[PDB]
Write a structure and sequence with these properties.
part of a larger assembly; 8 chains; A mainly alpha (60); B mainly alpha (102); C mainly alpha (46); D mainly alpha (176); E mainly alpha (358); F mainly alpha (80); C: 46 residues; mainly alpha; 0% strand; globular; F: 80 residues; Gamma-tubulin complex component 5 (chain F)
């Protein structure tokens, strides 16, 4: 089970590294929810739009 | 919290920096659109997504990362993400921005 | 969780199942109502 | 393998990379474990280690034949040029320890910058041995190769030349 | 093949005699053309004894290889390559049904080997600055074609692709290649180079005005191929310089200094020093054609006398369709050119006083 | 896996050959041995001393080390 | 001989190391496999033949102090560029524990064009050394192709840095120091007691680099000579007497020319 | 439907509202092919 915890922390860390290379803006915990949701076959074009539209709503 | 809908509440509540039940009016936004589409209509192939981020990355005066991305793209392939590699990473692209506004 | 939140969460499922505006009609019916009765109805799914 | 080579490039030759006087660290065996051709990659890589084994034998005798306070100063220098080539063999192992897939190629790429400083700093050392530039004319053979032109070997030889100038600024400060 | 070697040299001699100021115009090593691998194009079970839905998987497998230019086991690429028309030979013993369909999916191959030959031959220094840009942005569409054949292979690997699915899948790129292969035949057929292949790209873009599937490809090939031509005009309009290393630009500078110098016997500057070319006019700039020459010549007769002449701001210019913004800029520069020369002349070299004392 | 170098003696097995018995010490144990030796200590199992001459013990093997390369580094420490 | 066998071999013919079932059997012709698959290898195996040319020449040209300060700097760059082709190859190896992207035809395409142009630049710069070599690289930055013009014009910045190093010393510092005949001025040693100004310095004509006007080459000597006549004769050692190159020569050189002469 | 489109794009005189009509009648010929693809997929359909 300790090896399972190291597997996830290793891969979430790699995914955070790409996120900063593309300069996407997601922090670790929002990335955590995002991969956990997209992990169950979510149409990721639909999710991308939702995240863009709330980031623009929170501007006030 | 494993079930899909539950997650969005948490996703929404942190993206929108407010209280748990207060954000529902906007929260309602996502319920309709995410529900609208679940079963993707575009087939599975990571290479296309990979080829896209290098090209995008290359025309922006940042070309070492055209292979730094490649090195990372295999690191994850080494570990287990259950064939959602195309779906995640793709997401991370469509939310992109060159650091300079240009 | 408050009453309004535990209705939409239920509504989403139906849309994945294929029940559509029968799930939006539910959104408008609740909206039209605007008490804790829905919370009891919520517990009683079937 | 990735600890046998990442020490064979260092001074300890080992069974795979047999040492010989006519040619140094030349592995010569057909091995089922390495791919038939990795020996060709290794042969190219082996060139770097052979000069590192030799450069230390020379710093050892110094610091009838060559003698002096300058060979006790050019030699301290050959230690500093070789210092970023020791730290860069320690890091290779650290990456290799955890990542179980990185193959020999990663050694090739990481240690390709040391195929310009090392071959052109080896002619300065053979020149100082074939010809006994033992007296103060040692400074000439560093400043004659220091104009250089291959930029990695042009600042390397600069590191060695300046040290000489510090010994030549202490004898000429006691006099004046 | 052998006949091409001539054209490249004859064109080379023309730029060498014309310009002796820039020497040793570059050429590529002989192997660049001789080696056939660098360019893209170059146990067999009897299919007659097979069941039907196995031949489809085989023919699909062979076609997937033909699209990228590599020969296939059951379908061969004929090597005649006579004239400019590539032809292909399918195995004789197959099902007539499948055979006809193969011929209907085979034109995207003849529009792939013909397209690739044009990207190798018209990339040499001899063909001129614009013919190089047209093929260097035509090579990008080849990579995106290679991309598509790789995605189709993965579907084929999972037993989930058929010749009826492949037929629908390749239709979008059957058109892109057809527009690129016809345009390449024409730029080659008329021996067009310089601006003669910057007009042929403006006119073809109009030909399809309603399509929008092919219009975007052509409108793109002209944005890419006109990047070097606009850069030359930007130097000539804003300074008297005409770098033009190969003879392509519309304006040309005759070395009439040899005869007219010390005494400007011909007053050559306003007569035959800076003169125009007809067949190297871009066909969109023909309305401003005369003005361009005047715009730049006027700059020289102050840039000749040592009084510093500098444009206040040099603005960059990009090809565009539907929006002639280049028109207003050519005018903004033209007006500063005439104004500066006239002001200097009516105060320095003052003409009003000399005209009275005559 | 490359963490078991010289563990396979298939190369050795290609001709008929007798395997010699070796202790199989861990690489971590070797570091503790040298640090004690570099300071004053006698009768260490590695670097066995015989006549005022400290000499590398004849038979020590590690998972990720061939017998010859380990002898080379160890002899090299023993000289100090 | 399954394909899994070919992919393993081709990934080394990229360095240029002869493979197991692929070898350079004909010594001048490209590697030949010992059917559709066979043909595909050829395009992929060309990168090796091109690789053999650039690497065998920067291995040797680098060790020759004769080629000159300019030329050894061209090799650094042919080699720093080869280093990068190897970061792509290292990954491909690890991606081996599918990776048959049309046998990586799309993976190889971006290094394959960056290999045609450096391999061309080596045979056009053969024989030439010093300033003549620098022009032979300014020769290859006259092609409209945007990606090839991006690549050469970077190599040229390195190649012509030594050159401009001899330019910003023989004007400012006062003296010129080249062992091989590379710089575009040619000093001749002799007594030159009072004849110094008229004969000691003369413009050589093979080594003015192609990105310079003959007027500029003639003017630079007039500064090199003046700042040297001012030390060896007038005996007034006043120290530190203070796109071709981004349009800064025509700005700096006239500037140096003006200060120097006004003092003399 | 296909015989007509096969000949008009082989006519440079069909005009500029005829080379728009003849390119509008392929988008509605392609989708017929798209349906055929699906007819093929369920074959392993009477």
């Amino acid at each position: 089970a300790a090896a399972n915890l190291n597997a996830v922390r290793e891969t979430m860390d790699v995914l955070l590294e790409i996120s900063r290379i593309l300069n996407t803006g997601l922090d670790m915990e929002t990335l955590s929810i995002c991969v956990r949701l997209c992990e169950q076959g979510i149409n990721p074009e639909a999710l991308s739009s939702v995240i863009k539209e709330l980031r623009k709503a929170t501007e006030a | 919290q494993k079930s899909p809908n539950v997650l969005l509440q948490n996703l929404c509540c942190r993206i929108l920096g407010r209280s748990e039940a207060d954000v529902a009016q906007q929260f309602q936004y996502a319920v309709r659109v995410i529900g609208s589409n679940f079963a993707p209509t575009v087939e599975r192939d990571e290479f296309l997504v990979a080829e896209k981020i290098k090209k995008e990355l290359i025309r922006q005066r940042r070309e070492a990362d055209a292979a730094l991305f490649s090195e990372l793209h295999r690191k994850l392939h080494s570990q287990g993400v259950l064939k959602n590699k195309w779906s995640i990473l793709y997401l991370l692209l469509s939310l992109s921005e060159d650091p300079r506004r240009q | 969780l408050p009453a309004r939140n535990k209705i939409l969460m239920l509504s989403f499922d139906l849309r994945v199942g294929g029940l559509g505006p029968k799930a939006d009609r539910l959104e408008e019916l609740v909206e039209e109502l605007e008490l804790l009765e829905v919370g009891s109805v919520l517990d009683l799914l079937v | 393998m990735i600890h046998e080579l990442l020490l064979a490039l260092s001074g300890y030759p080992g069974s795979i990379f047999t040492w010989n006087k006519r040619s140094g660290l030349q592995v010569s065996q057909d091995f089922p474990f390495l791919h038939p051709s990795e020996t060709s990659v290794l042969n190219r890589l082996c060139r770097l280690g052979t000069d590192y084994i030799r450069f230390t034998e020379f710093i050892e005798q110094y610091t009838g034949g060559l003698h002096g306070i300058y060979l006790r100063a050019f030699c301290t220098g050959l230690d500093s040029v070789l210092q970023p080539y020791r730290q860069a063999l320690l890091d290779l192992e650290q990456e290799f320890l955890g990542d179980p897939h990185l193959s020999i190629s990663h050694v090739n790429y990481f240690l390709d910058q040391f195929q310009l400083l090392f071959p052109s700093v080896m002619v300065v050392v053979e020149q100082i041995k074939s010809q006994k530039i033992h007296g103060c004319q040692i400074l000439e053979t560093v400043y004659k190769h220091s104009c250089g032109g291959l930029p990695p070997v042009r600042s390397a030889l600069e590191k060695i030349l300046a040290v000489c100038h510090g010994v030549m600024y202490k004898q000429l400060s006691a006099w004046m | 093949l052998q006949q091409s070697l001539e054209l490249k040299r004859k064109m080379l001699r023309d730029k060498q005699n014309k310009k002796n100021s820039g020497q040793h115009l570059p050429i590529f090593p002989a192997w660049v053309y001789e080696r056939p691998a660098l360019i893209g194009d170059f146990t067999a079970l009897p299919i007659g004894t097979l069941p039907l839905a196995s031949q489809e998987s085989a023919v699909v497998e062979d076609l997937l290889y033909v699209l990228v230019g590599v020969d296939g086991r059951y379908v061969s690429a004929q090597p005649l390559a006579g004239r400019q028309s590539r032809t292909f030979l399918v195995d004789p013993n197959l099902d007539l049904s499948i055979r006809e369909l193969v011929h209907r999916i085979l034109p995207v191959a003849a529009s792939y080997s013909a397209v690739t030959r044009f990207i190798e031959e018209k990339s040499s220094f001899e063909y001129g600055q614009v013919n190089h840009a047209l093929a260097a942005a035509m090579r990008t569409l080849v990579k995106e074609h290679l991309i598509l054949v790789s995605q189709l292979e993965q579907l084929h690997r999972q037993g989930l692709l058929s010749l009826q699915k492949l037929w629908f899948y390749i239709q979008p790129a059957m058109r892109t290649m057809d527009i690129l292969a016809s345009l390449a035949t024409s730029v080659d057929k008329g021996e067009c180079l310089g601006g003669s292949t910057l007009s042929l790209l403006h006119d073809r873009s109009f030909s399809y005005t309603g399509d929008s599937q092919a219009q975007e490809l052509c409108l793109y090939l002209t944005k890419a191929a006109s990047a070097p031509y606009f850069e030359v005009l930007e130097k000539w309009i804003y300074r008297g310089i005409i770098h033009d290393p190969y003879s392509e630009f519309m304006v040309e500078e005759h070395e009439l200094r040899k005869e007219r110098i010390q005494e400007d016997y011909n007053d050559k500057y306003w007569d035959q020093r800076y003169t125009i070319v007809q067949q190297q006019i871009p066909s969109f700039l023909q309305k401003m054609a005369d003005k361009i020459l005047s715009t730049g010549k006027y700059l020289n007769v102050v840039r000749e006398c040592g009084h510093d002449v500098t444009c206040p701001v040099a603005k960059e210019i990009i090809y565009t369709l539907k929006e002639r913004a280049y028109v207003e800029q050519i005018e903004k520069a033209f007006n500063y050119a005439s104004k500066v020369l006239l002001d200097f002349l009516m105060e320095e070299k003052e003409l009003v006083a000399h005209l009275r004392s005559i | 896996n490359l963490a078991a170098v010289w563990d396979q003696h298939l190369y050795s097995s290609d001709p008929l050959y007798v395997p010699d018995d070796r202790v199989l010490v861990t690489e971590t144990q070797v570091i503790r041995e040298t640090l004690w030796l570099l300071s004053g200590v006698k009768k260490l199992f590695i670097f066995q001393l015989i006549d005022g001459k400290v000499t590398v013990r004849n038979n020590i093997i590690v998972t990720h080390l061939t017998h010859s390369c380990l002898r080379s580094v160890l002899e090299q420490i023993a000289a100090y | 001989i399954t394909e899994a066998a070919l992919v393993r071999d081709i990934l080394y013919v990229f360095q240029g190391i002869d493979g197991k079932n692929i070898k350079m059997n004909n010594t001048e012709n490209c590697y030949k496999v010992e059917r559709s698959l066979r043909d595909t290898a050829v395009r992929l195996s060309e990168l090796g033949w091109l690789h053999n040319k650039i690497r065998r020449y920067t291995d040797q040209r680098s060790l020759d102090r004769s080629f000159g300060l300019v030329g050894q700097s061209f090799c650094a760059a042919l080699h720093q560029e080869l280093r990068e082709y190897y970061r792509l190859l290292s990954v491909l190896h690890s991606q081996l524990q599918s990776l048959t992207l049309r046998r990586l035809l799309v993976w190889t395409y971006d290094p394959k064009i960056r290999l045609k142009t450096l391999a061309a630049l080596v045979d056009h710069c053969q024989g030439r050394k010093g300033g003549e070599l620098a022009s032979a690289v300014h020769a290859y930055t006259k092609t409209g192709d945007p990606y090839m013009r991006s690549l050469v014009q970077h190599i040229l910045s390195l190649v012509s840095h030594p050159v401009l190093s001899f330019l910003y010393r023989w004007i400012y510092d006062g003296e010129l120091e080249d062992t091989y005949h590379e710089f575009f001025v040619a000093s001749d040693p002799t007594v030159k007691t009072d004849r110094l100004w008229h004969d000691k310095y003369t413009l050589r004509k093979s080594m003015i680099p192609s990105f310079m006007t003959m007027d500029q080459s003639r003017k630079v000597l007039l500064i090199g000579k003046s700042i040297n006549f001012l030390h060896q004769v007038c005996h007034d050692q006043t120290p530190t007497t203070k796109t071709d190159l981004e349009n800064a020569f025509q700005g700096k050189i006239d500037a140096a020319y003006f200060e120097t002469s006004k003092y003399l």
